[PDB]
Enzyme design. Sequence first.
Site, PDB file in Angstrom:
ATOM      1  CD  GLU A   1      -0.123   6.716  -2.917  1.00  8.69           C
ATOM      2  OE1 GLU A   1       0.294   6.893  -1.620  1.00  8.69           O
ATOM      3  OE2 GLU A   1      -0.717   5.677  -3.216  1.00  8.69           O
TER       4      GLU A   1
ATOM      5  CG  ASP B   1      -1.876   0.605   1.323  1.00  5.33           C
ATOM      6  OD1 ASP B   1      -2.175   1.676   0.254  1.00  5.33           O
ATOM      7  OD2 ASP B   1      -2.945   0.830   2.146  1.00  5.33           O
TER       8      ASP B   1
ATOM      9  CG  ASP C   1      -8.275   3.914   0.263  1.00  4.41           C
ATOM     10  OD1 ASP C   1      -7.884   2.834   0.170  1.00  4.41           O
ATOM     11  OD2 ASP C   1      -7.552   4.933   0.997  1.00  4.41           O
TER      12      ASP C   1
HETATM   13 CA   LIG Z   1      -4.288   2.247   3.252  1.00  2.00          CA
END
Ligand SMILES: [Ca+2]
Length: 701
Positions: A441, A438, A503
């Site tokens: 960025e 995950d 998400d």
């Molecule tokens: Ca996450």
Amino acid sequence: MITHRPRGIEHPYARSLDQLYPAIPIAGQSLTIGATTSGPCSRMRCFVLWPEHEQVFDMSPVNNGWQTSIPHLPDQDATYYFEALTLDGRTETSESFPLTPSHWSAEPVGHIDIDGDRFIPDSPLWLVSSAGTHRVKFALRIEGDEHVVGFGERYDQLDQRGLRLDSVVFEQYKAQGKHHRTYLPMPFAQVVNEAGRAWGFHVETTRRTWYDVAATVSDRILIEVDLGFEATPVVRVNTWSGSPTDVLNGFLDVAGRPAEMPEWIFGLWASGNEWNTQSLVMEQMDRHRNEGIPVSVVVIEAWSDEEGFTIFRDARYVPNQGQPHRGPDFTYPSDGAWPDPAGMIRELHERGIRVILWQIPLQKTDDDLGPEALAQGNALIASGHVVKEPDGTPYKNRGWWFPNALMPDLSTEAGRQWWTEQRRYLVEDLDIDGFKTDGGEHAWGSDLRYEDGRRGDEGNNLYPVNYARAYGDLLRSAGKYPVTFSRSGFTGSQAHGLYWAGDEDSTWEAFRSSITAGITAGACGILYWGWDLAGFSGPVPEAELYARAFAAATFMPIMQYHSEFHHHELPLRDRTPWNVAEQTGCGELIDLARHYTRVREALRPYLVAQTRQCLQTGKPLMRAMFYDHADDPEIWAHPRQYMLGDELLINPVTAPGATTWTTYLPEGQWEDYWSGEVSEGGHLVTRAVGWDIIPVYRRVG
Ligand SMILES: [Ca+2]
Ligand SMILES: [Ca+2]
Ligand SMILES: [Ca+2]
Ligand SMILES: [Ca+2]
Ligand SMILES: [Ca+2]
Ligand SMILES: [Ca+2]
């Protein structure tokens, strides 16, 4: 003191209060100048020293921010500094700052290296100043009947013609489509006409790029390219022409191709952030088996001490001074969260379930960390394998999440090995099968320094590729398939693992955006794509959304359900078929999950065979209509239908309350997947859609 950073915090879509706007000032346009003071002040002035005279701007408070602005910036090099009067009567003065305004020039300042017949020879404009060449603009010709698909994973629409966008790695927490941003952009697109022919372009850079796709000028694609911090440049643009597949192959030959994966990735993926104990994970695996809804993968996010993401919660050990641990260093208490994680993995493997652990490319440093996490952070700094600021100090994360965390430098082999060696025992001793990589960025700043020699202007977008690569290399070295599950990426990500859409809320619009995300991702070579079915955030999805989403997911590359952390508060937010059924009062959901998971199992030989063909042909698995039917213009009016491999046409039901759904069938004969009813192609067909149906059509071979 007075603080001013010309480029500010360097958030890609937002300005801070202590910067210039634009960051690269342009003669003739307005310039906003901002600064902050550490203490309170009554006045603050900005002095600008042009060659022939001076000017004083009395600044105004904004929201301790101060601001002034020049309406029309003169084309002359100057010097500026700030002066503040504190409430107690002190005069504070800043350092001196340069102002070298740029202008657009049509001179051959640089060279655009490009072939093909769409480049407009006289369009190149170079943004120049006494200090260097900062960006370039040029144009490509587009014809009336052309459609533009690409730029990586997009959440707004399939055809980008008429839009303005950019390609910069960014974390947009939810509503990616509404904001027109993405975690996985690429500076590449294919252009397809209604006769079925295509061409494409790839700006060979990892710096930021902007695209005006016939939005301002109806027959021109305007492309703007950042040339970076160390401002006679050569910008290389790769081009290809032929069938849509030839264009994608051309790009994959430069970018990289999808890797081979094991068959087990095609079963159901189960996940829930609030499964933070061995008993909670096993309770759910036991329920899957008891309900006849088999899973092939379980992802565990909340597995570690939540400080170093290297050791299972409650594990006892002699602490290290930052070096890597081995399996035997750990003793797991029987009353703890994970009494025998090795035993869990062993039992789950005997049941045919693989295990994946969550990771983040960040090292927390804050107030209340234990001695192990502080040591691990200090050893990271001491190794020198950390992304650094221009001054050589370690980069501190500028995001609101994981504030001030360090970022490992994964740009060189030695850097990747130092970070991943800390996790080797998880694969070699505990025997896990992969990682959910995950994030990625977090690097902002064009002047950051990487051990590979690149500065932030180039390395920041490249970061997620190196990150996925690092973990894939760890897994390869331990005798396993490189199964990483990531959300961010850039050119080159094609070759490193699997991807999910990120998400989102549990809404119908998000479901529609997710479909677009998968198709557009497939069109840039991201083959193994999935999404959090029916959304992971907020209250559980209503029954109808879950049902429609679960059905759609069944006909996508990675079928996966997941739920966001919610402080273990009431009510339970797991996206398990039983929990959604409990909360919504819709018992049928459990039967529907059984029904579609059974379909998923029957579909695995097809998915495996089609994946082999995809690797050979270069075509996507979740495939846009234009790859195989570009000579049929009607496809563009149905951008959320897609092919799954060569034989199946899928059309997810994305509206609440639909009892029928219309699908456009291209030429040839089509067979209803559920009833065997044969339809003639080349027109619209209407199908009744009870919840146990998602319109799927198979070509008659
Ligand atoms: Ca996450
Ligand atoms: Ca010129
Ligand atoms: Ca030790
Ligand atoms: Ca056993
Ligand atoms: Ca909601
Ligand atoms: Ca081959």
